[PDB]
Symmetry: none
Subunit: 337 residues, 2 copies
């Protein structure tokens, strides 16, 4: 069998095009078929060589790129996959300066098969329990990439979910979305990330995705929904805590003003109060009005499915069946007595 050292030497000898690919293809077969023993002789040195090559193809502007650049990037990613299917391999991948960012950069929707593979590896990394905030390390890399390209960090994932893509790509994009959100301890993080996806157009995408006759998509959708529901209930529990602690009118008001102080929220708070003063000064109507307002504020702030209200939307759906013929006239008719 071919030695890890032979491969390292070849990788550093400036292979191009079909020759590069030949080498990467052979290495990939070696990586998948050899014992972990052999992967270790490949090691950090071997990994570093793959990542340099991937870097310098990733960096290559459209006008000077080779015809086999995609193929070669993708073949490197298949090598990373093989390198990482064992404990030594993931560990050393995590220990790199740039491995995760280069995996993020491989998430190119114009090369969807490479994007499927890079997303599957980023998901596996998010779900690792050690080190501790792996999902945040993956998100950090996504953010770095967005900063360097001046793009929204979740845009490639959203592009992967467009109607024209393969089902495998849709499923892998939603899988990575689940892997970023679900392992997060903090409710605030999850709602933040979820609301960020929604502002990018996730909701309409989801509507489309719900029509797909595919079991794996149904599973990822379900996992996405479960987590939204769990977050709704965790937030609903936070509201009960508040309703129990904060029962002094002056103190609640003081805390709101502290929160809202010198922010763009302050003029909106005043306006809320100013409009309350304009509630129908009518003994039987005024309680109903305040109830209706409470119903509304309730459904805004405790928004269903654990996401912010869509602030760009014209209309806001409020469940009103919980608040509400000539049955009033005939019941008062029991004035018979």
């Amino acid at each position: 069998s071919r030695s890890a050292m032979m491969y390292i030497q070849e990788l550093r000898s400036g292979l191009r095009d079909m020759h590069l690919l030949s080498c990467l293809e052979s290495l990939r077969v070696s990586l998948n078929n050899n014992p972990v023993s052999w992967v270790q002789t490949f090691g950090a040195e071997g990994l570093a060589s793959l990542l340099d090559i991937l870097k310098r193809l990733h960096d290559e502007k459209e006008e000077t790129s080779g015809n086999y650049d995609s193929r070669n990037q993708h073949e490197i990613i298949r090598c990373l996959k093989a390198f990482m299917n064992n404990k030594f391999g993931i560990k050393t991948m995590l220990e790199t300066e740039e491995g995760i960012l280069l995996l993020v950069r491989a998430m190119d929707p114009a090369v969807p098969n490479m994007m499927i593979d890079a997303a599957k590896l980023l998901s596996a990394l998010c779900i690792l329990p050690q080190p501790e905030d792996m999902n945040e390390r993956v998100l950090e890399a996504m953010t770095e990439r967005a900063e360097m390209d001046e793009v929204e960090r979740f845009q490639p994932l959203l592009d992967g979910l467009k109607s024209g893509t393969s089902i495998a790509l849709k499923v892998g994009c939603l899988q990575l979305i689940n892997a970023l959100i679900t392992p997060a301890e903090e409710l605030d993080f999850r709602v933040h990330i979820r609301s960020e996806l929604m502002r990018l157009g996730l909701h309409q995408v989801l509507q489309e995705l719900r029509e797909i006759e595919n079991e794996d998509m149904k599973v990822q959708l379900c996992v996405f929904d479960e987590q939204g529901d769990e977050d709704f209930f965790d937030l609903k529990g936070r509201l009960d805590d508040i309703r129990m602690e904060m029962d002094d009118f002056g103190e609640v008001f003081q805390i709101i003003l502290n929160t809202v102080k010198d922010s763009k929220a302050e003029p909106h708070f005043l306006s809320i109060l100013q409009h309350l003063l304009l509630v129908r000064n009518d003994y039987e109507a005024r309680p109903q009005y305040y109830k209706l307002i409470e119903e509304c504020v309730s459904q805004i702030v405790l928004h269903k499915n654990g996401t912010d209200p869509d602030f760009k939307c014209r209309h806001l759906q409020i469940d009103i069946e919980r608040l509400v013929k000539t049955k009033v006239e005939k019941s008062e008719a029991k004035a018979t007595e």
Copy 2:
């Protein structure tokens, strides 16, 4: 004379610069000098083709704009004014999809003299008794403009009140403020608009206007104060007093709801505000949305939502509240029949 059809054809070639301007200039003279039978010949079709050019011009990116764009926009506003100087023309303007909006977009503080002409036409629209919601159609147009240009809807009006502007502009902006508020039937609505002006800083702006030795400005200020005064007294009649103090406003709500069935709901509303996501960018938006829902609820009158910006709920609010009242009186008399 030049016929209405000739103008409509000219307006539909691709006239540019001084050529467009001289077409527009003779058109204006035709509109001011010919019989009203002539304006009817120009009609909705001549109107639409004017509004089309205006649209393209409003739209134009600075670096592809002609040297005479603003001159041509302004001359169309002069033609709009002439077209509207009669019952047929004003009526057909009201009927357009975008005339009012295009008028509002002409209110550009960088071209003050066009802004004056446009604001004057919008004030005349607001003051029409028929249709009955003309101030709401103008406010709607102001909200749509604010969304495009990404600004506060009353900012261009406060811009025209700035010290560096001409007196004609200041007077025109205040007249239009007056025309939005004064024809409004509902105290709620006048207070809503005036309150918004105030949060945008109108008060400090007004104090400076009070210093100008100009009769027209003094008129617009007195009209503003007299309506404000009346509103204050109508509202004091309802409550028994200041609008922009947080603590004072809060206390008055408290007193208003204290020991009634509204009081539990008011506390819970405040408590729900504490749940608003602790995020720099999302929090103002949560407050904004809540505010615009509260405004709609309070402003709603027999199927009408007077403010376009406060139409998030697709609910017949008063009908709903009537149903809610209905439910409380069935429980009360049913409770009373059982016993």
